[PDB]
Every structure is written in structure tokens, then in C-alpha cells.
Design a protein around this ligand. Structure first.
Ligand SMILES: CCNNC(=O)c1ccc(CN(CC(=O)NCc2ccccc2)C(=O)c2ccc(N(C)C)cc2)cc1
Ligand SMILES: [K+]
Ligand SMILES: [K+]
Ligand SMILES: [Zn+2]
Length: 357
């Protein structure tokens, strides 16, 4: 059992040239990486190299027009970059953004390949810019290409089209792009937990509600767990895993687990408003390790408190390495609205999953 780790400091080149304090900071990845060193976790991992995704690989999920537009930003001057970025929802672009997005995706491709060929058992990808808001045809919410979605399709391309991939998205925001890319697909199970607030929280769409269960053959393969009216934390995430994520995931029996591992639900995050602890994230990671014979790839998404994300992601790597999970209290009562959310998801998905009946 070997754990892979991918990190390339070049991904720090993507930056906001008009707001040096924008929360999607270059040092998000360097702080996580340096915490892995300080905790003596890096030397326990097999270092997997970063690489650029190719344009053909980007076409696994993205349109040619979208690829060409982001590609063209490499040669743009500042005011043209500002105009292009301003055309999207919550995007900044520099002339290194395209390359950094390619490196984020290619790093995850190399990690998925190492897992699926048995070079490592599991892996962590300390990458930016993030991916889960990116749609087939557009950038959004700090994301250019949908790294997690691309990695699922890349994994299928190097094994079988039918390779069962579970994507668990625990970033505090809904991964609208991931949901849409796989909405009609039963080979990729998408499960998102996210702050919803009746559609008021970013990305501000009722697509994130519990009644969006998938389309066509994909009915049942899109599981939205939306939180309303409460600062959710370890008890609520553990309960969602116990009642929903794990029963559904075990019935699906994935062959690869990708975690869209944002750490913006973490205690201390400046915008998530939630309070998942590093130990909570460890618990969730250890649960997912019981799936897919342990073939788990943890991919950084959001998370903006540099200390919180560094401690939280490092705790996840400690779990992948086989360290014992922290003991948590499974009998702490849930905040009332969390019980309402979980029950709503159970009612929506019971028709599709015998484990819920
Ligand atoms: C990729 C991983 N998962 N996705 C995220 O993590 C994520 C994606 C997008 C955003 C952008 N949004 C969300 C929003 O609702 N925007 C509308 C808005 C907010 C407040 C008043 C008027 C309108 C901010 O709120 C924001 C933007 C800038 C900012 N700075 C420069 C300090 C702070 C917060 C935040 C997080
Ligand atoms: K999510
Ligand atoms: K799906
Ligand atoms: Zn987020």
C-alpha cells in the first residue's frame, strides 16, 4: 500500500493581477505542501510528477470553443485578460492561468493512472486552479476546466468505458459543472454535500437541490445533499455519510473514488460558514477508503483559510497512508435542519437504491 502525492509549484503562477488579496491565492497549494513536509508526511508518499493535460484530453468534457478561448488567454495582455475574465461568473485570469489549469488536470491524470495500474493504492493532488464549477462550455467560480470530471473520463479511457467512478464532492459549494457533465450517465455516480440555503448560496441555482436525481439512464446517479439554515459540522457530515453516501456508494461499488476535496466547509474558512474539523475530514477519508479496494484520489478544490486547509488536507493524507482515524462522537445530535435535509435526500433516492429501502 503506497500513497501517491502530486504537487508542482508552477501552479502558483495563476494569480489575480487586480486583487492580490483574492481568496483563491497561489500560496494555498504551497502552504498545504509545506504542512505535509512539517508533519513528515511527504517523505512517506511516492511523488507522482505533474504534467500538462492535452487538448484532446480536455475534449473529454469540454467544448472546442471553450478550450480555444481559455487557450488564447496565454497570449493576452492585462486589459484583454480583464475583459475576458469579466465575461464569466467569478473568474480572474492571468497569462499563466491556462497552463496552470492544464497542470492541475494532468497531475490528476497521472495520479489516476498510478492508482489504476497498481503503482500506488491511493493518492492526493495538491492542485489549483480548482475545477468543479467549470461546465462543458464555460468557466465559472475560480474554475476553468473540470479537473475531477476530466479525471473520471481519463480513468475510463485507460481502463474501460464502463469503469464505475464515484465522485464525492465535499467542497462547501455545489459542483454544478460535475453534476451537469454526468447528469445522464450511470457510469459516474456524483454525490455532493453543499451549503444550499434554498438556492441563495453560490452558485445560486436550484440545480443543487435534492430533487435533481439525474436524467435518463442517469436517474439515481446524481445525489445532492443540500444544507439549509445551520452551521453544519462533523455530526451532520458523519450522519450524511452513514445514512446516504456510504449505503449508496457500497451498492454502486465503485472501482475508483475521486474526491472533489474542497476544504471550505472547514472550521475557520472565511467564506464557507461551516465547521468541519480536520478530524472530521479524516473520518470521511477513512470511510471512503473502504470503497473501491482503497483506490481513492483526493483532489483539492476550494478552501481559503491557509491553516485550515493545510491541517485538513494533511489529515486526509495521513488517513490514506494508513494512520488510525481519530475517534469522534457519533451520538452528538444533529442540528434540526440537517435531519430535514437528510430525510429529503432519502425520499428522493429510495426509489433508485435498494440499500435505502
Ligand atoms: C471552486 C471551489 N468552490 N467554489 C468556491 O469556493 C467559490 C466560488 C466562487 C466564489 C465567489 N463568491 C460567491 C458569491 O456568492 N459571489 C456573489 C456575491 C457575493 C457577495 C456580494 C455580492 C455578490 C464570493 O462570495 C466572493 C467573491 C470574492 C471574494 N473576495 C474577493 C474576498 C469573496 C467572496 C466564492 C467561492
Ligand atoms: K460539494
Ligand atoms: K451521474
Ligand atoms: Zn467551494
Amino acid at each position: 500500500p503506497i500513497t501517491g502525492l502530486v504537487y508542482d509549484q508552477r501552479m502558483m503562477l495563476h494569480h489575480n493581477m487586480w486583487d492580490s488579496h483574492h481568496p483563491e491565492l497561489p500560496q494555498r497549494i504551497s502552504r498545504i505542501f509545506s504542512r505535509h513536509e512539517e508533519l513528515r508526511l511527504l517523505s512517506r508518499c511516492h511523488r507522482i510528477p505533474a504534467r500538462l493535460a492535452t487538448e484532446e484530453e480536455l475534449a473529454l468534457c469540454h467544448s472546442s470553443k471553450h478550450i480555444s478561448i481559455i487557450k488564447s488567454s496565454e497570449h493576452m495582455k492585462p486589459r484583454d485578460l480583464n475583459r475576458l475574465g469579466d465575461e464569466y461568473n467569478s473568474i480572474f485570469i492571468s497569462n499563466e492561468s491556462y497552463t496552470c489549469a492544464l497542470l492541475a488536470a494532468g497531475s490528476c491524470f497521472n495520479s489516476a493512472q498510478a492508482i489504476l495500474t497498481g503503482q500506488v493504492r491511493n493518492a492526493v493532488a495538491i492542485v489549483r486552479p480548482p475545477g468543479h464549477h467549470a461546465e462543458k462550455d464555460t468557466a465559472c467560480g475560480f474554475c476553468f476546466f473540470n479537473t475531477a470530471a476530466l479525471t473520471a473520463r481519463y480513468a475510463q479511457s485507460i481502463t474501460r468505458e464502463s469503469l464505475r467512478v464515484l465522485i464525492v464532492d465535499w467542497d462547501v459549494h455545489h459542483g454544478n459543472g460535475t453534476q451537469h457533465i454526468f447528469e445522464e450517465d450511470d457510469s459516474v455516480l456524483y454525490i455532493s454535500l453543499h451549503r444550499y440555503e434554498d438556492g441563495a448560496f453560490f452558485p445560486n441555482s436550484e440545480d443543487a437541490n435534492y430533487d435533481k436525481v439525474g436524467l435518463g439512464k442517469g436517474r439515481g446517479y446524481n445525489v445532492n445533499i443540500p444544507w439549509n439554515g445551520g452551521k453544519m459540522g462533523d455530526p451532520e457530515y458523519m450522519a450524511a455519510f452513514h445514512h446516504l453516501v456510504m449505503p449508496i456508494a457500497r451498492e454502486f461499488a465503485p472501482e475508483l473514488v475521486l474526491v472533489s476535496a474542497g476544504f471550505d466547509a472547514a472550521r475557520g474558512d472565511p467564506l464557507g460558514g461551516f465547521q468541519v474539523t480536520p478530524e472530521g475530514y479524516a473520518h470521511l477519508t477513512h470511510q471512503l477508503m473502504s470503497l473501491a479496494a482503497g483506490r481513492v484520489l483526493i483532489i483539492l478544490e476550494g478552501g481559503y483559510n491557509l491553516t485550515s486547509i493545510s491541517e485538513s488536507m494533511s489529515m486526509c493524507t495521513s488517513m490514506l497512508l494508513g494512520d488510525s482515524p481519530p475517534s469522534l462522537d457519533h451520538l452528538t445530535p444533529l442540528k434540526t435542519s440537517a435531519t430535514v435535509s437528510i430525510n429529503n435526500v432519502l425520499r428522493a433516492h429510495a426509489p433508485f437504491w435498494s440499500s435505502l429501502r
